[PDB]
């Protein structure tokens, strides 16, 4: 009868799981990525109500039987975002437990199934979050696409375009990104790229998708592309080093896992990241995520219930 809702409000999509209290996932629903930092409050509210009422429609149950709802989304570390999100859910008539957290917290829960450890996210954006044996948490990075996101897919895509333009205008080393980016975007000229970036309403996810071009060019032997991937791995490592140092974990065993397409898909980048960690923090044990972030939100929600 009773159930919990876990929502991963990620940059790739919005992903909901509804689960019984025995962790049997009854259904999962996908919507478009929608975040109050990049959409209006009205746009996000509509997605949240639609998502929740939809799943409750297929499940054939009311909000009264929902024991807890956990939502993890980018930017939800700020209490300003927290209250706005809780209000949207309260406005549906939900009267139970609501837990609003940053996306890294649900990724850590789903990845490790414990409170302690470190998560690195590199998808559209990037962040590192961890919690030590003292129960104390810390984060590094996560400052968004203008003043942060180092080593993210968005950052890789911007750097790829900059390298392609420097190749074209002779400020930088020649790279096959110069033509490969235009081919990928179905564009004819270097000027079509300007209108695409500055006028077309391109999304963060679309720019981050150029990471696929960087990976393909690296496999073709492109040196500029290899260097972009290595430096992204270095930025992700720096985010771990920061959290490890802040939490006094430099000489302790730590379990670390990784989420997002950049870090988890690209063999060279993942290998470089692991090499940096193995050399500098040999007691960090790197593992794959045991479950996805939506299931992490289910764990956080259900763990607050009897």
Ligand X SMILES: OC[C@H]1O[C@@H](O)[C@H](O)[C@@H](O)[C@@H]1O
Among the residue ranges 46-54, 98-106, 281-289, 294-302, the one whose residues contact ligand X (CB under 6 A): 98-106
201 CA to centre of own chain: 22
Local structure of 30: helix, strand or coil: strand
CB nearer ligand X, residue 180 or residue 235: 235
Decide if residue 102 touches ligand X (CB under 6 A). yes
Local structure of 176: helix, strand or coil: coil
Of 129-148, which residues contact ligand X (CB under 6 A)? 142, 144-145
Of 66-85, which residues contact ligand X (CB under 6 A)? 74-75
CB nearer ligand X, residue 38 or residue 216: 38
The answer to the question of whether 144 is labelled as a binding residue is yes
Pinpoint the alpha helices (H) of 92-210.
Answer: 103-112, 144-147, 153-169, 177-184, 190-198, 204-208
Which of 6, 111, 117, 125 is close enough to bind ligand X by CB under 6 A? 125
Taking each continuous run of H as one helix and of E as one strand, the counts in the chain are 13, 10
Local structure of 246: helix, strand or coil: helix
- In what side-by-side order are the strands of the sheet with 126-131? 137-141, 126-131, 117-122, 254-259, 284-287
Decide if residue 127 touches ligand X (CB under 6 A). yes
Which of 149, 155, 222, 272 is close enough to bind ligand X by CB under 6 A? 149
Q: Least separation, in Å, of the C-beta of 238 and ligand X?
A: 15
Strands 254-259 and 284-287: what pairing? parallel
Q: Which residue is nearest to ligand X (CB)?
A: 125
Give the integer Cα–Cα distance in Å for 118 and 254: 7
The answer to the question of whether 149 is labelled as a binding residue is yes
Asked if residue 230 lies in contact with residue 116, where contact means CB atoms within 8 angstroms, the answer is no
Decide if residue 247 touches ligand X (CB under 6 A). no
Q: Which residues bind to ligand X, rule: CB under 6 A? A: 11, 74-75, 102-104, 121, 125-127, 142, 144-145, 149
Annotated binding-site ranges for ATP: 12, 124, 208
Q: Which residues are annotated as a binding site for substrate?
A: 35, 142-144, 149
């Amino acid at each position: 009868m009773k159930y919990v809702i876990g929502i991963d409000g990620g940059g790739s999509k919005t992903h909901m799981k509804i689960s019984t209290l025995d962790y049997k996932v009854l259904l999962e629903v996908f919507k478009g990525p929608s975040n109050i930092n990049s959409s209006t409050k009205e746009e996000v509210k509509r997605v949240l109500q639609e998502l929740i009422m939809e799943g409750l429609g297929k499940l054939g149950q009311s909000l009264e039987e929902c024991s807890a709802i956990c939502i993890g989304t980018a930017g939800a570390d700020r209490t300003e975002d927290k209250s706005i999100i809780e209000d949207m859910i309260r406005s549906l008539g939900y009267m139970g437990k609501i837990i609003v957290v940053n996306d890294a917290e649900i990724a850590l829960a789903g990845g490790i199934e414990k409170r302690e450890g470190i998560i690195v996210i590199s998808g559209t954006g990037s962040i590192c979050y961890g919690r030590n044996k003292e129960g104390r948490s810390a984060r590094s990075g996560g400052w968004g696409h203008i003043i942060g996101d180092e080593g993210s897919g968005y950052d890789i895509g911007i750097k790829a375009i900059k390298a392609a333009l420097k190749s074209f205008d002779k400020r930088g080393e020649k790279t096959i990104l110069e033509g490969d980016i235009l081919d990928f975007l179905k564009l004819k000229s270097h000027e079509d790229l300007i209108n695409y970036i500055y006028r077309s309403g391109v999304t963060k996810k679309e720019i981050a998708s150029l990471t696929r071009v960087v990976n393909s060019a690296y496999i073709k032997g492109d040196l500029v592309s290899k260097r972009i991937l290595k430096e992204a791995a270095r930025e992700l490592f720096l985010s771990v080093k920061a959290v490890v140092e802040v939490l006094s974990m430099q000489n302790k065993k730590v379990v670390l896992t990784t989420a997002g397409g950049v870090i988890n898909n690209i063999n060279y980048l993942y290998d470089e990241f692991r090499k940096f960690l193995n050399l500098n923090y040999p007691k960090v044990k790197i593992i794959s995520m045991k479950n996805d972030s939506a299931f992490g939100a289910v764990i956080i929600a259900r763990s607050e219930c009897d």
